[PDB]
């Protein structure tokens, strides 16, 4: 039973430092090759570095953009793998994996030093590098109208703007209204702040009678907001 558990992820300012841990079990850790891999938000897997076993003298290789700032190490007696990061930059986000690394080499068609592949992975740990400070969201109404209405149904919602850090949870009418509701994934503005939207489609008939209130919760800033969404008055 192979288990890999990464930890140590958290928020850190640009130019700051952070150390990630990875506890391993269920295989011969002493001779195992270990690799760190990171996946930036909305991007793919990127190879960070690898540390070998005793045969090659515990040698370490790093990806170019990371070298000189990152350091990989290990303590075999407690089965721990480390990634120590100095002078962190924003690009150094966001989700880091440790992986048991196997070695492959075909003697008849292959080329040295063969290939390294990744047999087992951990759940990962999230590293967030931003200068941004904790902020509560400003909530604005997305009011329904003729332009927002088609086929006997209307669309209304809330704009949860400029908050930090993730996440925000949104419900409608204290959870009572769940049908037709969709809360979008947050987007990350250049300012370093997050924004998202929560929409619910409802019968056009209901607009006159039914009341619609979105409940925004943001635990990182300890802020709760009950916001009513009604059709705008043209006057």
């Amino acid at each position: 039973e192979v288990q890999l558990v990464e930890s140590g992820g958290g928020l850190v300012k640009p130019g700051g430092s952070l150390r990630l841990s990875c506890s391993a079990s269920g295989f011969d850790f002493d001779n195992a090759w270990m690799t760190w891999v990171r996946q930036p938000p909305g991007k793919g897997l990127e190879w960070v570095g690898r540390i070998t076993g005793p045969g090659e003298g515990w040698s370490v290789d790093y990806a170019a953009p990371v070298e000189g700032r990152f350091t990989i190490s290990r303590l075999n007696s407690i089965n721990f793998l480390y990634l120590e990061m100095n002078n962190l930059r924003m690009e150094d986000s966001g989700l880091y994996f440790c992986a048991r690394t196997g070695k492959y080499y075909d003697f008849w068609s292959g080329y040295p030093p063969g290939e390294e592949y990744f047999q087992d992975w951990g759940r990962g740990t999230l590293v967030t590098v931003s200068s941004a400070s904790t902020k509560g969201p400003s909530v604005f109404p997305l009011a329904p109208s003729s332009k927002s209405t088609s086929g006997g149904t209307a669309a209304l919602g809330c704009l949860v703007k400029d908050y930090f850090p993730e996440p925000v949870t949104v419900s409608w009418n204290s959870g009572a209204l769940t049908s037709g509701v969709h809360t979008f994934p947050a987007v990350l503005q250049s300012s370093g702040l997050y924004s998202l939207s929560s929409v619910v489609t409802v019968p056009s008939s209901s607009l006159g009678t039914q009341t619609y209130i979105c409940n925004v919760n943001h635990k990182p800033s300890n802020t709760k907001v009950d916001k009513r969404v009604e059709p705008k008055s043209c006057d």
Binding site: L45, W47, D106, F118, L159, K161, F184, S195, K232
Partner: protein, 212 residues
């Protein structure tokens, strides 16, 4: 990248598909393949010359020729809808390793559905905050791939735009959102603003005017 992959590939449910990885290093090295789903740890699918890990279904298989490596899925299932990454050396004889950009595989199991689009103008509330955000909501479309373009009057709008990656709704159809950040001055200085959503070659457009 050093290893190039298709940005996205689609396949009918229960059919065969092949995604590729090309790079000069592959001429001398073998590639490994990985499946990745959101919020889940990657899985090694295939490696070496002809190596498949036990537990991985046999519909997965790898091949190679020249500077290219290929991953083939014979009989695509619904669960196979995921991200796929190839990995190998960055150069020939290198001790370093590298991943391709990755390919988003879409498994088509439902009828095409036209996107329902709603464009919200900046609320009077927000404008008082000296801010202005155009919100373009897109919903009930299939498959989950859209292109959003904004227009100020008739001219394209470059900056201020933020768009999310499409996500599943309750009814397994996809939804996406796009934001245009304007200053109240910019907002009031144009005759109209338009949100153009392109889905499966067809384009739907919603417009709002500041005179409201």
């Amino acid at each position: 990248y050093e290893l190039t992959q298709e940005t996205g590939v689609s396949v009918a449910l229960g059919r065969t598909v092949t995604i590729t990885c090309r790079g000069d290093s592959l001429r001398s090295h073998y590639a490994s393949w990985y499946q990745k789903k959101p919020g889940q740890a990657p899985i090694l699918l295939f490696y070496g010359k002809n190596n498949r890990p036990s537990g991985v279904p046999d519909r997965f298989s790898g091949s190679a020729s020249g500077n290219r490596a290929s991953l083939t899925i014979s009989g695509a299932q619904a669960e196979d809808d995921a991200e796929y990454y190839c990995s190998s050396r960055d150069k020939s004889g290198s001790r370093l390793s590298v991943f391709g950009g990755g390919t988003k595989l879409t498994v088509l199991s439902q009828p095409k559905a036209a996107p329902s689009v709603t464009l919200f103008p900046p609320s009077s509330e927000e404008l008082q905050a000296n801010k202005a955000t155009l919100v373009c909501l897109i919903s009930d479309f299939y498959p989950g791939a859209v292109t959003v373009a904004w227009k100020a009057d008739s001219s394209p709008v470059k900056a201020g735009v933020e768009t999310t990656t499409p996500s599943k709704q309750s009814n397994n159809k996809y939804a996406a959102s796009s934001y245009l950040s304007l200053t109240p001055e910019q907002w009031k200085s144009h005759r109209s603003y338009s949100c153009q959503v392109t889905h499966e070659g067809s384009t739907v457009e919603k417009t709002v005017a500041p005179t409201e």
